[PDB]
């Protein structure tokens with residue numbers, strides 16, 4: 001039987017790389033990640049607003065500081081057990097992405113509530129969760145659970161602006177010292193359905209490919225590397 | 229420190245037998261069984277609306293493979309933000325590979341290349357079968373790489389028919405009955421309403437209620453279910 005799924009933490013998702021109304025939020029996550037923050041943080045916002053990025057960045061920071069993190073993408077609740085939450089309070093940072101994937105589920109709600117209390121009781125670290133709505137609007141039912149969420153810090157992420165994506169791309173390319181012609185950036189942006197996560201995955205592949213082949217990112221080179 | 233993996237667990241009650249026999253899926257299910265058993269089917273792409281049964285059927289295919297002691301691997305591609313295309317390499321050890329929600333990366337050129345390459349490796353010899361699920365047909369899901377769409381259509385493609393919404397009570401009662409649990413109509417309706425008619429949540433709760441009923445030697449009643457589920 002299959003016991004696990006290999007996962008990885010993208011190395012370009014850090015607090016620095018995040019495209020800059022989000023300041024207090026970052027400081028709270030950094031503090032949590034370092035052992036100096038609140039016991040519970042709840043981050044919410046619309047799809048593609050950067051919830052996963054920021055969770056990844058918190059885990060990255062905790063790892064930097066030789067602190068142990070555990071990440072759960074709760075969107076895949078159909079293939080995992082509430083038993084997974086047991087003993088996680090032994091970690092310095094526990095992150096549950098898309099915790100609202102199980103909103104209204106009596107068994108998951110009780111298990112998560114129990115985890116909140118165990119993390120609090122251990123006093124070593126923090127639980128960070130993300131959702132697409134506030135605690136009182138995401139559909140959580142267990143009143144005690146909603147209380148734990150509401151009593152921690154709660155941050156709303158503002159939506160990413162579609163017309164700011166090119167600026168975000170050129171910034172991320174610059175931070176890599178990757179030369180990206182403006183028009184090639186615009187091509188890539190619009191060929192990737194204007195999806196930043198796809199774009200940034202591609203940017204990483206092109207950065208490596210450019211080094212390997214000692215070539216500039218031209219249209220012919222990008223088409224060849226991406227099979228476009 | 230660094231996290232290398234996420235524990236997962238195939239639900240034991242999601243089999244071909246437990247599936248509610250919604251009309252219109254006999255051919256698809258026969259194909260899934262063949263792929264799971266190694267009886268000849270090499271690749272299946274099944275698609276349908278949310279809650280139609282795609283993950284259940286993938287789980288059932290894995291369950292069937294596991295009972296035959298065939299090696300299966302399940303990838304929920306919805307979590308692509310936390311996995312690498314490198315995961316698709318080295319799966320040569322497997323009799324069955326399942327990619328749930330493969331359309332999560334539709335249009336992503338690196339994932340499309342990697343998936344195309346996986347199709348080729350699976351199709352190269354009889355050993356190994358691939359099952360993938362999506363919310364739309366290979367074209368309508370927005371896969372871009374022409375070679376990938378061609379490979380998907382070299383395999384079998386099926387639209388999954390969901391059950392009728394009005395059949396959810398019958399589905400709940402049937403799965404409870406198959407485990408020896410009588411689920412009365414009033415309790416079934418109360419729970420359907422209370423859980424927003426989400427069958428996955430309800431099926432998860434019926435298991436706790438089965439044990440509660442046996443331990444206390446009590447029929448399910450609305451008051452009893454409220455107590456046991458912290459409602």
Ligand SMILES: Nc1ccn([C@@H]2O[C@H](COP(=O)(O)OP(=O)(O)O)[C@@H](O)[C@H]2O)c(=O)n1
Pocket residue numbers: 013017018019020045046047048049050051052053054160168196197198200309
């Ligand atoms: N302020 C932001 C927001 C998102 N992003 C990027 O936008 C993409 C989508 O972010 P995400 O997967 O974290 O979004 P959600 O988890 O909120 O749906 C990723 O590539 C992020 O790195 C960014 O760089 N800066």
Ligand SMILES: Nc1ccn([C@@H]2O[C@H](COP(=O)(O)OP(=O)(O)O)[C@@H](O)[C@H]2O)c(=O)n1
Pocket residue numbers: 078242246247248249250277278279280281282283284285390391399427428429431
């Ligand atoms: N014909 C069906 C379809 C779904 N189901 C169940 O309905 C719930 C939702 O199915 P699923 O998670 O496989 O749905 P999707 O993956 O299609 O979104 C699960 O509990 C399934 O076991 C069923 O019992 N019989």
Ligand SMILES: [Cl-]
Pocket residue numbers: 316317341342343345346
């Ligand atoms: Cl591959």
Ligand SMILES: [Mg+2]
Pocket residue numbers: 051052053097309
């Ligand atoms: Mg996310």
Ligand SMILES: [Mg+2]
Pocket residue numbers: 282283284328
């Ligand atoms: Mg599913």
Ligand code: NA
Pocket residue numbers: 270349350351352353354355356357
């Ligand atoms: Na094969």
